[PDB]
Structure formats: C-alpha cells, structure tokens
Write a protein that binds this ligand. Structure first.
Ligand code: HEM
Length: 291
C-alpha cells in the first residue's frame, strides 16, 4: 500500500483555519458534556484511535482513509464512547463538506489540544477517503490490563520509541475512564481539561493502591480520588520509562515539545507527502484571533 497525500481541491491555509475555528467555537459552547469536562478529552482520544490502527508492516490502517466512518471500525469494542466525539464533529462536516473525514477527525485532536492550553501541534492536510473494504479489522488497538513490555511491543507497530510512548501517554491527564465504555472508572488528575504535565507528577507523587473496581478489573487508586490504568502505572515499573516520566514531571516545556512531535508523527503515519505538498500548517487559537 502507498497512501499519497492529496490536497482538497483549491483549498489553502485560510480554509483549514475556518474549520479549526468552527471546532473551537463549538468546544467553548458545549462546555457541559461529561460533568463539565467538555468535548476536548474525547476529541484527542478519537484522533489517537483512528491513527492507532496503523501497521508499519503492510501500510494498513492509520488516519489516511477516514474509515472510522464505517460500521466495522465505528462499532469496535475499543472505540466505545467515541460516538460522542463523532456526533460533535458531524455538524462541522455539514458546514465544510469539502474536508475529508481523516483530515477532519485528526484536526479535531489538534484543535482540542491547542484550545486546552496545550502546545501548538503542526498539522498537514491531504488525507483521502478510502472505500469500506479498506477498513481495518477490530483488535489493533491496545489493551489496558497489561505491563510495560506489552506497551513497548505495541508501540513498535507504529514505530514509536520510549520517549515518544511516554510523551504520548501524558494525554491521560485529560478526561477520564468511564465504567460503561472501558470497565475502568475515574480521572487521572484534578486539572482534566487543561493540558499540563500533571499525569507525570501524579504518577510520581501519589500513594497508589491496587484495587478491583465494579467491573472486576483492577486499577490503581489514590487517596486523592484519582486513578491509573495498569498500562499507565507500567511507566514507573520500567527503568527506561521511569527516567523519562521524571524528566517530564520536572520539565513541562520538554513534555510539550516532545508531545507535539510525537502526536503529529502519530497522525501522519502511513502517509506519503509529495514535496510539492504544502508545508505543515500552525493554526492560530481563538484567543490569538480575538474570537
Ligand atoms: C497503551 C495505550 C493506551 C491505552 C491502553 C489506552 C486506554 C484508554 C482507556 C481504557 C481509556 C478510557 C475510555 C473510556 O472509558 O471512556 C482511555 C482514555 C483516554 N485516552 Fe487512552 N490509552 C492509551 C493511549 C492513549 C494515547 C496515545 C492517547 C492520546 C495521545 C490517549 C488519550 C486518551 C484520552 C485523552 C482519554 C480520555 C477520554 C475521555 O475523557 O473521554 N490514550 N484510554
């Protein structure tokens, strides 16, 4: 498989900035979702899940083809709860019918990180909708009940190394686990719709206790009301992951820098960019625009 990025015909930076503006204006507006967490956290999770299906061995899956729109990928058990992020973006797609689905689902994640005070994420247009038979089979997305060795092996399929994996996992400072979606319950911290290095500080500073929850899954719980998935708790049981955790806990700007690079890499895996293609766009926030 080769997936060559093709620009939506006749569109430039200013068009994509209009789609970004519509998603961010709708984020401000619908602030009541999930006990006033807002749709920020569920939109960066949709962008990682349509990206996380990629397989470096045969160039299948990844963000290119927009195939989350098809029933098979939409109804995957590991995607439960993401129907909310899809529903949110749907009026935005009716307003800009020219943008491809892969470009929309992925720009949704970029807009959410930057509106939640996160780092600027460079983004590239050019994903193209592919047919229903290119939709990846279920089961390429990761389990939560596992250890640091599973996490290392998994992210190798997306050729993410240790630094990339630890930066990327910092996203779990956002939102929460929901019992009806995943069999896990609880937030990762206090500031869960502001993008910070909080996930790392919690993992180093809380007295975590292992307990079973109401779905009979184990998770790590702290006195403070926060939780950790076994796979996130893994990052302090592995000596290479633990030194990077410590680095991000002590330096939020190094976390922002590395998260920016790894998240763009994640959203562009599997896509060939012709060098006449536009350079990656940096979108302005609402605030920077006075909107
Ligand atoms: C081994 C890797 C990962 C596993 C096993 C995993 C698993 C999960 C699970 C079980 C949930 C809760 C789902 C729910 O009940 O609603 C969750 C939530 C979330 N995940 Fe991950 N995750 C992984 C990697 C990532 C990465 C790479 C990102 C983003 C860069 C990410 C971002 C999020 C966010 C923001 C949420 C919050 C969802 C919400 O608030 O609704 N995850 N993750």
């Amino acid at each position: 498989l080769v997936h060559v990025a093709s620009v939506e015909k006749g569109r430039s930076y200013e068009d994509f900035q209009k789609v970004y503006n519509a998603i961010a204006l709708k984020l401000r507006e619908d602030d009541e979702y999930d006990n006033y967490i807002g749709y920020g956290p569920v939109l960066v999770r949709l962008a990682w899940h349509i990206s996380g299906t990629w397989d470096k061995h045969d160039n299948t899956g990844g963000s290119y083809g927009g195939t989350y729109r098809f029933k098979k990928e939409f109804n995957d058990p590991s995607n439960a709860g993401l129907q909310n992020g899809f529903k949110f973006l749907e009026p935005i797609h009716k307003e800009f019918p020219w943008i491809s689905s892969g470009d929309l689902f992925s720009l949704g994640g970029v807009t959410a990180v930057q509106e939640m005070q996160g780092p600027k994420i460079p983004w590239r247009c050019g994903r193209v909708d592919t047919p229903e038979d290119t939709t990846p089979d279920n089961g390429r997305l990761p389990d939560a009940d596992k250890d640091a060795g599973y996490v290392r092996t998994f992210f190798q399929r997306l050729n993410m190394n240790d630094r990339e994996v630890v930066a990327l996992m910092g996203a779990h400072a956002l939102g929460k686990t929901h019992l009806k979606n995943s069999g896990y319950e609880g937030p990762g911290g206090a500031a869960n719709n502001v993008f910070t290095n909080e996930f790392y500080l919690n993992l180093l500073n809380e007295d975590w206790k292992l307990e079973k929850n109401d779905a009979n899954n184990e998770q790590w719980d702290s006195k403070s009301g926060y939780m950790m998935l076994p796979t996130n708790y893994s990052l302090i049981q592995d000596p290479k992951y633990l030194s990077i955790v410590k680095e991000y806990a002590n330096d939020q700007d190094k976390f922002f820098k590395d998260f920016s690079k790894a998240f763009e890499k994640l959203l562009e895996n599997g896509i060939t960019f012709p060098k006449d293609a536009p350079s990656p766009f940096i979108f302005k926030t609402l605030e920077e625009q006075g909107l």
